[PDB]
Design an enzyme around this catalytic site. Structure first.
Site, PDB file in Angstrom:
ATOM      1  N   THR A  94       0.858  -1.218   0.000  1.00  0.00           N
ATOM      2  CA  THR A  94       0.000   0.000   0.000  1.00  0.00           C
ATOM      3  C   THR A  94       0.874   1.242   0.000  1.00  0.00           C
ATOM      4  O   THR A  94       1.695   1.440   0.895  1.00  0.00           O
ATOM      5  CB  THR A  94      -0.938   0.057   1.221  1.00  0.00           C
ATOM      6  OG1 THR A  94      -1.677  -1.167   1.319  1.00  0.00           O
ATOM      7  CG2 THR A  94      -1.914   1.233   1.100  1.00  0.00           C
ATOM      8  N   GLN A  95       0.671   2.077  -1.010  1.00  0.00           N
ATOM      9  CA  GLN A  95       1.463   3.270  -1.206  1.00  0.00           C
ATOM     10  C   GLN A  95       0.559   4.480  -1.302  1.00  0.00           C
ATOM     11  O   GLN A  95      -0.667   4.375  -1.269  1.00  0.00           O
ATOM     12  CB  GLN A  95       2.240   3.164  -2.517  1.00  0.00           C
ATOM     13  CG  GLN A  95       3.386   2.175  -2.517  1.00  0.00           C
ATOM     14  CD  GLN A  95       4.412   2.486  -3.598  1.00  0.00           C
ATOM     15  OE1 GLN A  95       4.497   3.615  -4.097  1.00  0.00           O
ATOM     16  NE2 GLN A  95       5.202   1.485  -3.962  1.00  0.00           N
ATOM     17  N   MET A 122       0.245  -6.432  -3.367  1.00  0.00           N
ATOM     18  CA  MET A 122      -0.338  -5.258  -2.707  1.00  0.00           C
ATOM     19  C   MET A 122       0.701  -4.176  -2.406  1.00  0.00           C
ATOM     20  O   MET A 122       0.622  -3.482  -1.396  1.00  0.00           O
ATOM     21  CB  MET A 122      -1.091  -5.673  -1.435  1.00  0.00           C
ATOM     22  CG  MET A 122      -2.270  -6.597  -1.698  1.00  0.00           C
ATOM     23  SD  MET A 122      -3.549  -5.840  -2.717  1.00  0.00           S
ATOM     24  CE  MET A 122      -4.218  -4.652  -1.560  1.00  0.00           C
TER      25      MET A 122
END
Ligand SMILES: *[C@@](C)(CO)[C@](*)(O)[C@H](CC(C)C)NC(=O)[C@H](Cc1ccccc1)NC(=O)[C@H](CC(C)C)NC(=O)[C@H](CCc1ccccc1)NC(=O)CN1CCOCC1
Ligand SMILES: [Mg+2]
Lengths: 233, 240, 235, 231, 212, 222, 244, 195
Positions: A1-2, A107
């Site tokens: 997740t960024q 992810m």
């Protein structure tokens, strides 16, 4: 997740009779701040491919390094590295598309939208898109971000389908690209006037143009516009 | 981890470590299994060079694997405990997943499989143990008697013996045991088992252990006096 | 000592060659393939008369369409059979079909050389894998601990193998019936066996497309033995 | 003698005896021949049987639509190496949408075999391979040896009595190299080459095994009645 | 879904519908919700289609491996418990399964086991599982007797599914019948509700709520 | 938060005849209200006379097809070039899909071909592997528009024989490849009219014992 | 590789014996003798220290007799260092059992587990066995007073009276001669010392060359007490029996 | 799973456990036995999360039976209860804990005394004269506080138990379909068939 920090906006491209054209402005935005102005978002791979990248610039620089390393690796134990066993646009694309999809499946995506433009060994034009989700598609015209909304409509007026490609010259195609870049400068808040443009022709090869500017802009009519309705002065 | 291949083939096609494990079984105290018409009897030798023993607490030669299956053995005593423990765990695991106790064949097959695994696993030596596994399958009245050995082969026996001087007692059983008519009663089966051990043992005092297994988890171990009565009866009939 | 996966100067793996000597000591197993089916027969060879011969399981089902006979260190075959059965059922689960006899044999033979310093030594058992599939029909395979498998029209393995193989060379032809093949296994088994052949110390089996893999009863084999003796006395 | 117990040991003269004994397993193996022109590459293999009741051991294995090999020596080791090639060919296709170069195929096999000759516990592969293929630089023929040495050739042969076929190809070099756009003639040259390695036995219908790959020809194997043409 | 299975004098009846939904969207009307595991074993499927279909075909593979290893057909108890122990390992992961393992063996006789994705495993004579289970129970319970004939039992199982197919929106399509005896299971056809409803309405004189 | 899924629109359709089968799908690729491509094929020849389409999230669809194509390749290697039957392919795909049960491929998968008796076969999958053989199946964005029309025209649902008092149903029968392609073209033109994600082009793959043929038709581009 | 230097500790001889176990037993046979005698109302543990030096601190020393818990003790024969590894394991095992069941561990269960550890070293791991033989003396409410012995093979047996270490052959004959079942603790104490006094390799048996312990129910009402004898207490018991 | 009760009297332990198994708005079964025999003189009833209850009970049962075979000896109710508590005490800090509450009724043959232990899913053990899990306690405890005597017979205990069930049947919202009653004493475990 960024979450993307320093970002690059639209990358636009199209096919013409002998090759492909691709363009992207030289801006590295930091939210609403137009932070970096000397950013090159078109990266040549060999003398037959140009990868245009939008989105997160740190992830773009990572991809640059991968492509740079790909060229080095391909040259290993390869006497025909500058001939038959040279890197093709389709090889470079499929590699990136594999990486992008593997990263989204973990992810932890590369927050980018990429367009690989090039000319194959047999002379065929190559133009394909891939993004952070691993989604891929090809079309006579391809654009990312705002370019998808504003450039594609303009570029599709020139090349609306496959049969329009042989009828489109490099002069007409470049004119449309340069026009589209002007429209994006008018209407995209995270765009810059300065941009780079690359042409990959099956005859004349790779022509990389830097430090282009949007020009022939219409602003004069602004003086006549007064107020927001009733105001006369 | 220790990886060495200890059990390996020799030029003549033998696995000496498995064959030397059989020599350890041949050294062990004699154990005999005889199955009758409605029962199985497991006889076991106990060497009499050990006096001052405490027979209450000394590990018994015959071990219960479940309420309906028993396991006796010949060879290395320490090795036998590992097989018995594994067998007991598998017995409870079978009841848990299949909702039914193990068959004698299944339990034998498991134990035999463990013994085999140790003949081609790196870093381990074979079990110096041969077992006699006996009992009755759930809701079944047919007597079962199986034998295993270090190599991992197993098979069913009408009557069988293992351990030291087992070839002598096997000779005895081969002529005295009738396939067409096995020991019809418990007494007959126990007597034949005791008789067979008396060919080898020495004295019929605290040297012979007998364990009788009957259908529906009915297992009981005989006491000294009970066994001694068989010894006394056999010797009087012998003098003829 | 010396490494387990060592080559001899002649270019053979010592351990594989030594495992073959163990297989020569094993009881005889014979397989014959016909267009009406494949027949598998084995010598039980009870070490003592008290041993209940029906518990000697040297012929084994892998699937409904694949059977297996063994010879050598028979205890080693258990994990091979287990693997074969899982391979057969697993393939049915993945592909909703029966698995080819050759593919099954290949799966078993992949275990063979997975030894060294994986398991500690090669298998000390040879297998005759018989079966049927829609593509290649009735098949008989000989799976060795070398990892090699040959397809055979007929094959004998075990102590009387070289004598039995020479006999199978003369007797086999492409038009053998199932009944003829059954008698031929019994005939050759009786020749190479030490003790006298009967229903208790020898076992027959077959695999047919229609009825699948079947191990014969002692009553059925006894009649084939009696039928065999009468036919040899008849000329 | 004292230096042949394992692959990790050098002899006083600098030899690896276990690698040499692995090489010996190839010499015992049945003969197989490889040769190519500019348009096609051909494998010819003499298959071996246990006896008349047995089948003939398959010598040729397909790796991709454009590549494959023939084996001589331990067949299970060929299965391992061919499976590795299949995966590498496949990796190149899925990741790079690129057919694996025959030269890289050789480099990958060399490096896989080498690791087995420098480490304790393992053993060298006991098989020799002749890899043929057609890629972006035309037709190719490689000879793999389990020492790790891979060699690109116009033609060659490995196995028992392979020297006869190898001498023939060395004489015929100038002829068969120019057999372009003609599959059947290139095979004929290969079948005549392998015939120089025959003693007492001759090429029968279920004995001969041929494979071919080329410009407009996927790697395909011919066995049984399909090779009756070339006898 | 609606599925049921009950035990009676003449063995076991098993009846299921054939509808598949993705919300309010009717995706299929011809789904096999009974899995034939072996000649003496059946498995009903309710809840997640893929979960049920995948794990019950896997169950049949495990039941096959059992009879190869043990030279004997697996018990209904052992079969149901393989499935229940499997789903229990995945407890909390989000499997959705409401199954019934029905079969006959010598030692057990006719036996039904309810098995669901939250690990529950129950032996019982009557079970109804699915979104329309209550509608099926209503008819089934009110007409059930142990001394039902094979003919009457088959009809009750069919009629109970029809009742649910009618009232429950996510139930319908067609009825699949099975009868399990000492000799094994017997298929008793696929019955479309489109025709079956009117046929039953006319002959039985029921369903007076509906405009005839 | 990063959302790993997307909707690329499009719709697909598979119909099975007596000795043939078709698998159709529009060539439009979209994201939100934008068109990505007017011609991006999503119906593929996978070998062994099996055609396949995984509609929904394109990245997952492409990955699945790619994996199945690869599964076919290895099936040949491992089983002596045996032909992969349509029923065997279906089961294999179930395991591919269910293998990601807890991070699914967001696609509706349909394959088409011929069964082992030579008859037309269509198999349809949900995102996690539940599959069923059918005569008829529409999948994707406009499936709800197309599917009830197919029930009516292919399976003759709700159609009774005239004059029979709605007692005798219209009898089932196989359709010709010509009649089927008419239904496909009419289904897609109707879907193009009423669904915004459907249009641009229509590509049909027809499967017979002779092989796999293609047919392309233009669709409205608005 | 390393194969060259492997002794192969866990293998059989051609005769079916475990080389290392046999040689470990040979090692133990040179260790100071230890005797256990079980009476009806208690147990005696007696052990001879290995050739004592006059400058050895005797009172704050522990070589032979160790405490496993309140109800169980052991006499050691062999390598002390090896024994301590096993003793700490046995102590932990007893506490695990108590933590789990809220009951003191039955003697046999502790003995079995410790013997199972020894067995492991003879069958796998490639390590040398523990060169130790134990005499376990303990009490529980099931079997009452119990004597066991374990050796490097991992085989254990129960006894009424037993000796380990040096001169067990001679010692066991003497115990077999004078032992009887209705024996008391005080009589067993005398037997233990008399046996050591005759089997010892020393000139004369003295207090400084002995370790001694009893496990009686001599505490107040239905409870067991462990007494590890002090130097002065051994000196007194040696005079009281008329050895010095 | 809902109602499990336990009453220790003079010479026995009596366990009463509801027969209903409910899922959603349907009573799936009305004859469920929510208990397992751990040993000839030890009985454990259980209640809690679906699946967990039986899985836990049978896991404990297998362990105790394994012990009995190994030692040829029956563990005391106290020992069994401590073993069970430790397993639950491990469980509560696991990735997914057993959500099971149990009552362990046993007869100690060495002491010649009945013993009732109440253990919740956290691993909270208490020895009690009478015990309950869930909402049952909120009615029965006060009732037993009043009517219970320590010197009661098994028959008096059953009448006392009938009084509890009647109160639950009157004031409990859910229909729990009666109870299966089992008695644990010196002669082992037996079931009361008519309750
Ligand atoms: C009755 C009929 C209804 O309850 C039965 O209980 C049946 C059981 C039979 C079919 C075996 N159950 C269903 O029909 C079941 C209801 C359901 C739906 C979703 C989750 C759990 C239960 N339906 C399904 O399982 C369908 C089967 C389809 C129609 C082939 N599948 C889906 O809904 C799939 C996968 C659901 C899923 C489960 C677990 C993880 C991920 C997904 N989902 C979609 O198709 C999503 N959606 C449909 C519309 O198209 C866009 C995508
Ligand atoms: Mg539209």
């Amino acid at each position: 997740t960024q979450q993307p920090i320093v970002t690059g906006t639209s990358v636009i491209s199209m096919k013409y009779d002998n090759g492909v054209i691709i363009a992207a402005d030289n801006l590295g935005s930091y939210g609403s701040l137009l932070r970096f102005n000397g950013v090159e978002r078109l990266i040549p791979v060999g003398d037959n491919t140009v990868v245009g990248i939008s989105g997160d610039i740190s992830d773009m620089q990572h991809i640059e390094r991968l492509l740079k390393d790909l060229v080095t690796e391909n040259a290993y134990d390869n006497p025909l590295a500058d001939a038959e066993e040279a890197l093709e646009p389709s090889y470079i694309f499929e590699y990136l598309a594999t990486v992008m999809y593997q990263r989204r499946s973990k992810m932890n995506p590369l927050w980018n939208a990429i367009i690989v433009a090039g000319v194959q060994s047999n002379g065929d034009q190559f133009l394909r898109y891939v993004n952070l989700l691993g989604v891929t598609y090809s079309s006579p015209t391809l654009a990312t971000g705002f370019g998808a909304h504003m450039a594609n409509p303009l570029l599709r007026k020139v090349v609306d389908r496959e049969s329009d490609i042989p009828k489109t010259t490099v002069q007409v195609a470049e004119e449309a690209i340069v026009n589209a870049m002007r429209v994006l400068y008018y209407r995209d808040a995270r765009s810059s006037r300065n941009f780079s443009l690359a042409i990959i022709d099956k005859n004349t090869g790779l022509t990389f143009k830097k430090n282009l500017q949007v020009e022939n802009m219409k602003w004069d009519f602004a003086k006549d516009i007064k107020g927001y309705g009733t105001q006369k002065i | 981890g220790y990886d060495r291949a200890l059990s390996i083939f020799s030029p003549d096609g033998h696995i000496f470590q498995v064959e030397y494990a059989l020599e350890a079984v041949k050294r062990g105290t004699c154990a005999v299994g005889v199955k009758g018409k409605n029962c199985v009897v497991l006889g076991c030798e106990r060497r009499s060079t050990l006096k001052l023993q405490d027979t209450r607490i000394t590990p018994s030669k015959v071990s219960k694997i479940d309420s309906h299956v028993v396991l006796s053995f010949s060879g290395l005593n320490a090795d036998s405990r590992i097989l018995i423990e594994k067998a007991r765990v598998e017995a409870q695991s079978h009841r848990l997943t299949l909702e039914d106790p193990v068959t004698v064949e299944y339990l034998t097959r498991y134990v035999a499989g463990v013994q085999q695994r140790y003949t081609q696993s790196g870093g381990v030596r074979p079990f110096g143990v041969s077992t006699l596994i006996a009992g009755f399958d759930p809701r079944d009245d047919e007597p079962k008697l199986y034998q295993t050995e270090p190599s991992g082969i197993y098979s069913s026996w009408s009557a069988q013996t293992i351990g030291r001087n087992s070839k002598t007692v096997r000779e005895f059983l081969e002529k005295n045991y009738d396939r067409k008519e096995p020991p019809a009663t418990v007494e007959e089966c126990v007597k034949l088992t005791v008789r067979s051990l008396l060919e080898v043992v020495q004295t019929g005092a605290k040297n012979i252990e007998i364990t009788v297994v009957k259908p529906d988890s009915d297992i009981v171990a005989l006491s000294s006096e009970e066994i001694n009565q068989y010894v006394t009866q056999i010797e009087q009939e012998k003098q003829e | 000592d010396r490494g387990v996966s060592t080559f001899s100067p002649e270019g053979r793996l010592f351990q594989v060659e030594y495992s073959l000597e163990a297989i020569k000591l094993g009881s005889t197993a014979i397989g014959i393939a016909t267009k009406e089916g494949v027949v598998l027969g084995v010598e039980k060879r009870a070490t003592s008369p008290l041993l209940e011969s029906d518990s000697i399981e040297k012929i084994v089902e892998i699937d409904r369409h694949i059977g297996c006979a063994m010879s050598g260190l028979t205890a080693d075959a258990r994990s091979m059979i287990e693997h074969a059965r899982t391979a057969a059922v697993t393939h049915n689960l993945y592909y909703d079909e029966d698995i080819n006899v050759e593919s099954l044999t290949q799966s078993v033979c992949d275990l063979a050389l997975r030894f060294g310093e994986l398991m500690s030594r090669p298998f000390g058992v040879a297998l005759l894998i018989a079966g049927h599939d829609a593509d290649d029909g009735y098949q008989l395979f000989h799976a060795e601990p070398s990892g090699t498998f040959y397809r055979y029209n007929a094959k004998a393995i075990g102590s009387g193998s070289e004598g039995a193989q020479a006999e199978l060379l003369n007797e086999w032809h492409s038009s053998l019936t199932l009944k003829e093949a059954e008698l031929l296994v019994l005939k050759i088994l009786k020749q190479v066996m030490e003790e006298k052949l009967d229903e208790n110390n020898a076992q027959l089996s077959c695999i047919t497309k229609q009825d699948g893999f079947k191990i014969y009863d002692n009553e059925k084999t006894a009649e084939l033995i009696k039928e065999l003796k009468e036919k040899e006395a008849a000329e | 003698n004292n230096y042949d117990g394992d692959t990790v040991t050098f002899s006083p003269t600098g030899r690896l005896f276990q690698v040499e004994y692995a090489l010996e397993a190839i010499k015992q193996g049945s003969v197989t021949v490889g040769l190519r022109s500019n348009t096609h590459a051909v494998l010819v293999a003499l298959k071996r049987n246990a006896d008349e009741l047995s089948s003939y051991q398959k010598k040729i294995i397909k790796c991709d639509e454009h590549m494959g090999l023939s084996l001589a020596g331990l067949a299970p080791d060929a299965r391992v190496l061919s499976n590795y090639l299949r995966q590498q060919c496949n990796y190149s296709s899925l990741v790079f949408n690129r057919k694996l170069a025959v030269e890289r195929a050789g480099h990958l096999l060399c490096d896989k075999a080498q690791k087995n000759t420098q480490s304790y516990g393992g053993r060298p592969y006991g098989v020799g391979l002749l890899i043929i293929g057609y890629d972006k630089s035309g037709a190719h023929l490689l000879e793999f040896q389990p020492s790790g040495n891979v060699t690109e050739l116009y033609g060659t042969a490995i196995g028992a009595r392979s020297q006869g076929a190898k001498t023939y190809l060395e004489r015929t070099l100038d002829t068969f190299i120019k057999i372009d756009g003609n599959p059947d003639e290139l095979i004929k040259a290969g079948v005549e080459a392998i015939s120089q390695s025959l003693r007492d036995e001759s090429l029968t219908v279920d004995n001969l095994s041929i494979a071919i790959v080329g410009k407009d020809t996927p790697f395909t194997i011919y066995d049984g009645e399909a090779v009756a043409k070339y006898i | 879904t609606t599925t049921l299975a009950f035990r009676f004098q003449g063995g076991i009846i098993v009846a299921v519908n054939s509808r598949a939904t993705a919300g309010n969207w009717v995706a299929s009307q011809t789904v096999k919700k009974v899995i034939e595991i072996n000649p003496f074993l059946l498995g009903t499927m309710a809840g997640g289609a893929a979960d049920c279909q995948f794990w019950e075909t896997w169950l049949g593979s495990q039941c096959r491996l059992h009879e190869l290893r043990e030279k004997e057909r697996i018990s209904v108890a052992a079969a149901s418990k393989i499935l229940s122990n499997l789903v229990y390992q995945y407890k909390g992961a989000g499997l959705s399964m409401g199954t019934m393992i029905c079969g006959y063996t010598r030692k057990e006789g006719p036996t039904i086991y309810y098995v669901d994705s939250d690990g529950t495993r129950l032996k019982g004579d009557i079970f109804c599982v699915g979104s329309g289970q209550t509608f099926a129970y209503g008819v089934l319970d009110s007409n059930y007797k142990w001394d039902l004939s094979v003919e009457d039992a088959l009809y009750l199982g069919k009629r109970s599914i029809l009742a649910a197919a009618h009232r429950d929106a996510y139930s319908g399509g067609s009825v699949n019948l099975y009868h399990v005896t000492e000799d094994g299971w017997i298929y008793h056809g696929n019955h479309d509700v489109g025709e079956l409803f009117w046929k039953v309405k006319e002959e039985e004189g029921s369903f007076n709520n509906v405009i005839g | 938060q990063f959302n790993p899924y997307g909707d690329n629109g499009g719709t697909i359709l598979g119909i099975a005849g007596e000795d043939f089968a078709v698998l159709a799908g529009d060539t439009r690729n979209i994201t939100d209200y934008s068109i990505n491509s007017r011609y991006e094929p999503k119906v593929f020849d996978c070998g062994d006379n099996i055609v396949m389409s995984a509609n929904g999230f394109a990245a997952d669809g492409d990955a699945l097809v790619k994996r199945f194509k690869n599964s076919v390749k290895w099936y040949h290697f491992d089983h002596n070039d045996k032909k992969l039957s349509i029923n065997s392919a279906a089961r294999n795909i179930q395991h591919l899909l269910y293998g990601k049960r807890f991070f699914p491929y967001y696609v509706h998968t349909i394959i088409a071909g011929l069964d082992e008796d030579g008859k037309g076969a269509v198999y349809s999958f949900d995102p996690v592997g539940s599959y069923e053989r059918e005569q008829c199946r529409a999948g994707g964005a406009a499936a709800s528009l197309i599917m009830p029309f197919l029930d009516n025209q292919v399976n003759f649902k709700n159609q009774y024989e005239p004059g029979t008092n709605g007692k005798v149903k219209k009898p089932l029968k196989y359709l010709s490849v010509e009649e089927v392609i008419k239904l496909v073209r009419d289904s897609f033109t109707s879907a193009t009219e009423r669904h915004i994600q459907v249009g641009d082009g229509l590509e049909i793959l027809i499967v017979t014992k002779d092989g796999v043929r293609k047919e392309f038709y233009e669709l409205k581009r608005d | 590789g390393s194969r060259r230097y492997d002794s192969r500790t866990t293998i059989f001889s051609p005769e079916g014996r475990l080389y290392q176990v046999e040689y470990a037993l040979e090692s133990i046979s040179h260790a100071g003798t230890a005797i256990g005698i079980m009476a009806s109302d208690g147990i005696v543990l007696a052990a001879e220290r290995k050739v004592t030096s006059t400058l050895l601190e005797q009172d704050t020393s522990t070589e032979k007799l160790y405490k496993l818990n309140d109800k169980i003790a052991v006499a050691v024969a062999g390598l002390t260092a090896d024994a301590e590894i096993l003793i700490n394991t046995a102590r932990i095992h007893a506490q695990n059992y108590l933590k789990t069941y809220n009951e003191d561990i039955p003697v046999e269960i502790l003995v079995r587990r410790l013997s199972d550890i020894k067995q492991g070293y003879t069958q796998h791991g490639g390590l040398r066995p523990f060169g130790v033989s134990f005499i376990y003396a303990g009490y529980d409410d099931r079997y009452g007073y119990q004597l066991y012995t374990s050796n490097p093979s991992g085989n254990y047996t129960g006894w009424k009276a037993i000796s380990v270490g040096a001169n067990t052959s001679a010692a066991q004959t003497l115990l077999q001669m004078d032992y009887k079942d209705d024996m008391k603790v005080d009589d067993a104490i005398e037997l233990a010392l008399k046996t050591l006094s005759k089997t010892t390799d020393s000139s004369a048996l003295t207090y400084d060359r002995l370790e001694f312990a009893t496990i009686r129910k001599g505490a107040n009402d239905g409870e067991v007490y462990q007494k590890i004898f002090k130097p002065q207490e051994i000196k007194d018991i040696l005079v009281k029996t008329g050895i010095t | 799973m809902d109602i499990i009760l336990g009453i220790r009297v003079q010479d026995s332990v009596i366990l009463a456990s509801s027969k209903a198994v409910t899922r959603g708005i349907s009573v799936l079964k009305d004859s469920d036995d929510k208990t397992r025999q751990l040993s000839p003189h030890t009985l454990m009833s259980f209640a809690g999360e679906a699946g967990d209850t039986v899985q836990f009970a049978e896991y404990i049962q297998a362990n105790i039976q394994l012990y009995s075979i190994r030692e040829d000896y029956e563990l005391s109710p106290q020992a069994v209860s401590s073993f069970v508590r430790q397993e639950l005490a491990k469980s509560i800090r696991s990735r997914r804990p057993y959500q099971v509450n149990v009552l362990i009724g046993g007869y100690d043959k060495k002491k010649n005394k009945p013993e009732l232990y109440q253990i919740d899913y956290l691993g909270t053990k208490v020895e009690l004269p009478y015990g309950a899990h869930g909402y049952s306690g909120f009615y029965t405890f006060s009732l037993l506080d009043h009517h219970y005597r320590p010197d009661m017979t098994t028959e008096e205990g059953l009448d006392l138990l009938k009084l509890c069930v009647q109160e639950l049947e009157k004031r409990m919202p859910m229909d729990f379909k009666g109870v299966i009653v089992k008695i644990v004493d010196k002669d082992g475990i037996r079931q009361v068939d008519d309750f």
